[PDB]
């Protein structure tokens, strides 16, 4: 599964009463920044609110990410989430309030409902009458019959290289393809022809299934900037600039969001908005700041988590300004501010424990108690670290458990961010 | 010099790594792009022309085919077509310092340098080819 | 059903609540306090409305939160071109600020254009040589040239197909057959859709106005028009293809009646953002003929300008200054503050007690005014969590210690981590 | 549509005949000295002897530089070409400031080419009368000449042309009944269409059928094209043409504008020269307009002050608003007016005072009578006094919004009420400095 | 006779010395000190390669000169081929066509691996002269030592007959070979996660062998990618594999690059980022905060720091003996302790610029064997980096 | 290299005379000329992957006055095989396997 640094945080630990437990789903205390992430994640799944901040403000190493992840998993993968950086958006072919509003345009997801049903028929039986009028057989594993197209569809097939006995996918509405071979190219004894082969298709002669398509605004945005294809305005080479540099909002981006409502009012999209959740909010420039404290105002922005690490300090494009947690007091009032605390000795070391259950790794008490030691002695983080290569260390001694030993071992060896200081003095 | 095509290999898993099953793309009629075959006024035209529910023209199968062959026409939309079409010296020059000549005289005489070592171009083998791709290249 | 557009910062505004005298109202649609401000935005607006001068800009000053925002986006719903942009939008890493500032400038202008033609259209009966065009009401046959034999072959027209055709031998078939449909069972083509056969008579001129703004110079930039229409589009924009040629066409349209135009307002957020350069560059804009109305809001008093360690009111230089109508803001009172919350609480379907509605209300006058805002949708989430019918001030008291405010979030940042 | 601009009541420097100025200057009030200066240099433009000359229209804001610009401007009239430039435009990021400011200096001058061609037209009746067969040969068949009976719309008159165009003549679909455009020394046959005499109204097709030439056969067509020698630039720089241009991706990128200076000179110049001395074209060189001088950076001024020193170089019009203040991309380096002082030298100033109250009071019922709106003396005399504490453009703002509050009011004239009310609406920076 | 990989600096490394539980040694595989170093750089390898965990860095720390690079080199070489290994400046991420932050995250997807494994018919033959151009099924004479099979093929396929026929999937490829014609050949391909960029666009691979690619869809061809590589993952289709990703001297990436890192290292895919720094109490680029290596303490928190100590007398004398075995110098005890001295005054990189002086200048005058003497000319003649700054007294035009 | 004898065709069977003998190339359809290069009397010279119409041939006693001019007919055999001992940079082959100009796909031109 490849254990990731979030791995062990598969949901936020609210109780049905809403409270948060005091170590439950991979998540350890931090009871009052839980019962705020559980707030949010119930105004996020309301859908009637757009825009609205959120800012998992606190000290480093205090799991404001873990958090957000907690939110992320408990939404559901059926509801976008865009995970984002601060540094992302200084991008060098799209200008920065751009790149912020395709990630705002990411967060937001809608589900197309739709009935689509095929029309399989054997080519052997192409038979045309008239250009003005064509038929095509149906021979599957379960039945056979006889199918009536518009001259249309015929040129559509025509214009593919088809050959008696192959295996065509015809759709009710547009489109065609080709599938070679129907166990009767192989059995000829030809060799082969570039591609591969494939047996009859089993089921009924014509299928119809319901299909959910989770898409989301910035690909209808992608999809509108090109033309498509199909003429010679189809012409693509590579170096291609897919995201191109910027799509103006009225008149490309208000006829999407028509449409959409549209197919909505029709019951065809049901929209499903999302959230981003953009990490190291204070690398944003001012200049983004601004744009972003008004972007998120519109009637259409989604729910938006922040995360600051690092306190007051000289804002980015400024140079002179100075305001706490790095953002400017413009947008950082009407973002709901949910501080995280720091954790404690027995939690540090419960949390330990969680990652070594999820990792596989196995400690012992006195290992345990060390390596919490370890940890609140400079920060969790290094604990969390070296808990790996003392069970590598373990099983190359063949152990198969941690032991004071192994940690001391490993702990000597490494070096912290507060020791490599110290001994950096030299 | 001729340098040899550098042949890249490659696994065929990779040229099919963005296909997408056929029984989940559904139909994107979000294209807005239909502004290059669609006018204004045709689109109100066709607003104004689409034939009633009834359409008076195996029982169950053929209501079924009729009601769906009568959902697809009432999608109809147009950006623009009608506007873009409704709004609307080549000199002789020397290119260089030389009093009069002909241009393709001044492009012929001064040529010395060829390419030092140009190669054909790389081509990707992946010993198995999807037919989608080949297809598509063709 | 969710759509695109819900509940949002400034959807409880419906728009500039004003009487027919430009007599502000309490509170009408939305809006509440602000009265001075609000009988600026109606004046702004009825000058817009009127459309008599050109090159006039208004500045929206006051502290943050004092419904600068609130009352621009209140007179653009009761404003049609309108374009709302930052000072970030502008920055454009393949456009100079000047270039962007020149395209929001002519986008902000409307135009409608008048466009009569000659129309012929009907159903198809049988073709050669010669055409059989039929309608509802009649028949006709026509004769058909070089040209209209060689597009009734590169387009495959056919007996039943509604075909339409004007002057400039521009055919089109804008849809299939009619009642041969029925043959077609199963499959059914994808451009190859069904119509409604026409009627009345055969040719028949329509009249039809296209609506597009001043910025169609994007159209007439490239070879290709529709293609630069969606994405950025041109970069360039050379100054002789913009005045020399729009602008003297736009003219001869007016005056020959062709064409209308109708100036919008460019409202630009946050104009404290913007470089030297840009106001500079709006000095001059602003004294040309078609020049939008531009407003502007700002949060800033004696700052520095970007791009220069010069200070002035505003933040921005003082030339500018000098050609701006300032419309400062009132912060809000009590009852102003508890009336704004009573509307935020009804455009939400948020059900609050009266001795819940007096806290929200100190709240926010100890605290910022959208902090009292999301207080509202928070203690609606914690009862609805709880399953109560309506919000208490236990609620709002427990959101109130779960989210922190400004104040309370710098009071206990001790911490420096 | 009107659409009354900011300051369109400026109509000319407004100078008697003597050349001194007075009030009522065809709009523009005060500034003798200034108007004067300005009338000065445009006798110079007008002279179109001197070139590379650079003005500076120095004064304190609200001087109205930018009124006696566009005064000077529309005195010129629209024969001579003026481009308006504010230093803001040079910054570019697709092309270099200096190629900017060239290209802005060529659309600053203009050139009128003229172009006469003899044309014949009218419908066609083909004949070939019969001639023996070359005399210097033998015998046979041959053609000595081919007749071309034109019928225009006042008459008919056949046309002996020479035998060797028959080629383009079955070339084209030239047949007995249809319009052709005829070139006198050329020959080419181009033809326009059949007469709409014979347009049926029951043959569908267009494009086709054209009406009858209006006038005699034989036309000499005058006409002028006036294009700035920018356009000439752009002109020649793109290809057109074939040669797979039109493909999308890898050309649709046509903002290319980095020019050279070797296409700019040299062969451009040498065949304008060329079209002056033969007759072909009159050279026309117009003004340049750049407001806001001291927004351009030292690397702007420095080739300025080398540009200016070309024979080619237009007449420019600098106005500068700022006083002593740091040039740009430099290290705090003070110069007068924004300017490097070595550039200072090659303008002339021209100073701008102060408007007198009086003065002040003239312009802003100048304006309202442009706007069309009658005043009250009072609510002018309050006018005048609002626009004497705080800056004058603050007045003038004022009429408009005041008009409207009075004819919503139910009064048309605007009352010292209305601009009072307005006074308290709205007011000034100077007032809301009070933070 | 001269290869491309001529004799370098971190040539002479060829490996780990390090037992079977990663116990250093005194000299072996080419290193010869940095014990404790030694142990971290074997430990974090076999953490690599056993891949279960995601997501860890770590930092070289130590003075210039003290085996910094040597133990990344020899890291690298211990992983052996099959596994990707993306070397890298912190100067690379300065890209013009793609973001800093694009080109590091891209730099992260040439350090993640895949095996895929393709099972298809290749058959044998040989060029007869067939397919004889202008001068139906024809005639195809295939044909093996072991076995023939003359027979035809329709007209699709006797136009690709044609010095050894290698018919495979594709339209036909290409003394006789020998055995069965019918072979199953297993080939695995391993690329480093190219599927990103080798489905781009069209013509593509183009792009992936020239970096002409500007920055790539972003969250629009890297998610879908990643969920099909999973899919591919627990069916059998294929399996990804972990690489190292190493930034020789860091410092030179701004507080961005360190922000994205700060959360590049918490995905499923995230690479071992190894790092490497010199400088100590430095400003970070872009800011003023001064932190120690010119990382910010957010990031140097999620990473292991690995100091290196100086060498001594006995490891600088055996780094030379190494290096001289590695190139063609040989000496005398003398002249090895001379430079064993110069180098523990001066620097090692330097005693050994110093050592292929002498061994050239030994050259030069027929010697055989460098003596102490060659050493001494070669130091006259070629100067030291403090001893020119002792002669900068001269002021050879300063700032 | 010799004198277009014939150049009757995709693979297109080509007659090259010289001095030496005459040889009928069975040349790929890849080297098919597209300008003039006319099927008699044109003297080319092609080489293995771009062909050069050196010039026509000494045809220039069959008019007194025409535009093309003449070289002698070739004396080396049509098919020679000459050893060059080229000196390039890794540079030239890195550039030019970046941005290939060989070949004739019509990917490559537009490219
Ligand atoms: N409440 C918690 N319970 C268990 N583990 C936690 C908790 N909070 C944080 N952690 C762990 O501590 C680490 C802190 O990571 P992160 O969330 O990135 O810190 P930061 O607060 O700086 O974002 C995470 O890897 C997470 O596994
Ligand atoms: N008079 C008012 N009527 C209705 N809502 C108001 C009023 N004043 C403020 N608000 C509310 O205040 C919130 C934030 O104010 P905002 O517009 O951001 O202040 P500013 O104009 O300084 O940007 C908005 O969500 C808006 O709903
Ligand atoms: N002499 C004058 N007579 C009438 N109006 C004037 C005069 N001088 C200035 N104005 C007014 O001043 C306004 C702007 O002046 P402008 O040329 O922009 O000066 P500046 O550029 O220094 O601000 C114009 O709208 C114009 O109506
Ligand atoms: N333990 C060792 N064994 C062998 N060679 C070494 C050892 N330590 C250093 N070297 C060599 O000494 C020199 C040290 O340079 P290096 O450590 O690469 O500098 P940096 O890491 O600061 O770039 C290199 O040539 C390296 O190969």
Redo the contacts between chains.
């Keep these: 599964q490849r254990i990731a640094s979030h791995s062990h945080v598969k949901g936020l630990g609210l109780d049905e009463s809403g409270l948060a437990k005091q170590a439950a789903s991979g998540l350890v205390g931090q009871e009052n920044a839980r019962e705020a992430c559980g707030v949010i994640v119930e105004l996020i799944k309301s859908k009637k609110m757009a825009g609205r901040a959120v800012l998992l403000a606190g000290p480093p190493g205090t799991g404001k990410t873990a958090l957000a992840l907690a939110i992320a998993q408990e939404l559901g993968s059926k509801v976008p989430f865009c995970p984002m950086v601060g540094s992302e958006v200084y991008s060098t072919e799209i200008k920065k309030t751009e790149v912020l509003m395709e990630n705002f345009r990411r967060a937001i997801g809608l589900r197309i409902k739709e009935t689509k049903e095929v029309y399989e028929g054997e080519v052997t039986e192409l038979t045309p009458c008239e250009i003005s009028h064509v038929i095509i057989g149906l021979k599957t594993a379960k039945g056979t019959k006889q199918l009536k197209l518009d001259p249309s569809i015929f040129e559509s097939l025509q214009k593919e290289r088809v050959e008696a006995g192959d295996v065509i996918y015809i759709e009710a509405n547009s489109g065609a393809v080709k599938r070679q071979g129907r166990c009767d190219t192989y059995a000829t004894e030809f060799d082969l022809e570039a591609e591969e082969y494939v047996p009859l298709p089993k089921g009924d002669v014509h299928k119809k299934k319901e299909i959910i398509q989770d898409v989301t605004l910035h690909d209808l945005d992608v999809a509108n900037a090109r033309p498509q294809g199909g003429q010679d305005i189809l012409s693509m080479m590579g170096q291609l600039m897919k995201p191109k540099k910027t799509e103006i909002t009225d008149k490309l981006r208000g006829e999407i969001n028509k449409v959409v409502n549209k197919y909505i009012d029709q019951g065809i999209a049901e929209l499903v908005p999302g959230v981003l959740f953009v990490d190291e909010v204070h690398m944003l420039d001012i200049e983004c700041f601004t744009y972003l404290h008004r972007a998120l105002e519109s009637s259409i922005a989604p729910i938006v988590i922040f995360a600051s690490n690092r306190g007051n300090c000289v804002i980015r494009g400024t140079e002179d300004i100075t305001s706490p947690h790095g953002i400017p007091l413009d947008l950082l009032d009407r973002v709901m501010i949910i501080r995280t605390m720091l954790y404690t000795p027995q939690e540090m070391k419960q949390i330990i424990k969680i990652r070594a259950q999820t990792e596989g790794i196995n400690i012992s008490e006195e290992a345990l108690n060390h390596l919490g030691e370890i940890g609140t002695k400079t920060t969790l983080r290094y604990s969390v670290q070296l808990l790996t290569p003392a069970n590598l260390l373990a099983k190359i001694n063949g152990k198969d458990s941690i032991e004071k030993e192994h940690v001391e071992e490993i702990s000597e060896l490494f070096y912290d961010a507060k020791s490599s200081a110290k001994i950096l003095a030299d | ?3 040899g ?2 042949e ?8 099919k ?2 296909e997408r099953d ?12 239909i ?2 075959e ?5 689109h109100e ?2 607003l104004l ?3 009633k529910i009834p359409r008076k ?1 195996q029982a169950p199968v ?1 209501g079924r ?1 009729l009601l ?2 009568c959902a ?2 009432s999608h109809g ?1 147009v ?6 079409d ?10 260089c310092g030389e009093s009069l000549q002909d241009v393709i005289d001044r492009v012929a005489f001064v040529i010395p340098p060829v ?8 081509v ?1 083998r ?6 989608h791709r ?4 063709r | 059903v969710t759509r695109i557009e819900r509940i949002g910062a400034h959807s409880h505004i419906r728009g500039l609540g004003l009487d027919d005298a430009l007599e502000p109202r309490q509170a009408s649609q939305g809006m509440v306090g602000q009265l001075a401000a609000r009988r600026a935005a109606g004046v702004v607006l009825e000058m817009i409305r009127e459309g008599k001068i050109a090159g006039r800009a208004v500045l929206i000053a006051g502290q943050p939160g004092t419904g600068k925002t609130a009352i621009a986006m209140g007179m653009a719903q009761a404003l049609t071109p309108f374009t709302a942009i930052a000072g970030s939008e502008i920055f454009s890493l393949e456009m100079s600020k000047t270039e962007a500032l020149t395209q929001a400038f002519r986008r902000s202008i409307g135009v409608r254009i008048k466009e009569e033609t000659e129309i012929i259209e009907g159903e198809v009966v049988e073709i050669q040589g010669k055409l059989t065009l039929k309608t509802t009401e009649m028949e006709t046959i026509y004769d058909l040239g070089t040209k209209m034999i060689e597009s009734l072959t590169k387009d495959k027209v056919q007996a039943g197909d509604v075909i339409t055709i004007d002057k400039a031998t521009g055919k089109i078939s804008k849809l299939g057959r009619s009642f041969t449909r029925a043959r077609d069972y199963d499959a059914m083509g994808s451009q190859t859709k069904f119509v409604q056969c026409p009627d009345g008579e055969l040719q028949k001129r329509k009249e039809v106005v296209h609506t597009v703004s001043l910025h169609e110079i994007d159209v007439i930039n490239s070879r290709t028009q529709g293609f630069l229409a969606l994405f950025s589009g041109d970069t360039g924009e050379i100054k002789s293809e913009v005045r020399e040629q729009i602008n003297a066409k736009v003219a001869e349209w007016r005056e020959e009646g062709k064409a209308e135009i109708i100036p919008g307002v460019l409202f630009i957020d946050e104009v404290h953002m913007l470089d030297i350069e840009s106001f500079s560059f709006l000095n001059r804009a602003l004294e040309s003929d078609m020049a939008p109305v531009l407003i502007m809001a700002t949060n800033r008093g004696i700052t520095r300008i970007r791009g220069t360690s010069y200070q002035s009111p505003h933040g921005i230089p003082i030339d500018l200054l000098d050609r701006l109508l300032i419309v400062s803001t009132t912060p809000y009172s009590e009852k102003d503050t508890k009336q704004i919350l009573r509307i935020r609480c009804e455009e939400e379907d948020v059900e609050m007690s009266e001795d819940a509605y007096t806290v929200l209300t100190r709240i926010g006058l100890e605290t910022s005014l959208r902090y009292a805002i999301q207080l509202i949708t928070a203690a609606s989430l914690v009862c609805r969590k709880r399953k109560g019918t309506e919000v208490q001030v236990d609620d709002i008291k427990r959101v109130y210690s779960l989210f922190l405010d400004e104040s309370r979030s710098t009071q206990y940042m001790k911490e420096y981590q």
């Design positions: 010099y001729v340098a095509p550098l890249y290999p490659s696994a065929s898993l990779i040229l790594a963005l056929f029984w989940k793309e559904a139909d994107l009629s979000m294209f807005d792009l502004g290059l669609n006018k204004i006024t045709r035209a066709e022309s689409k034939k023209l053929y085919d769906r062959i697809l026409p939309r950006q623009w077509r009608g506007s873009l409704g709004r609307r010296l080549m000199l002789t020059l020397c290119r390419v030092a070592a140009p190669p054909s171009l790389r990707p992946p010993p198995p080819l999807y037919s080949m297809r598509i290249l």
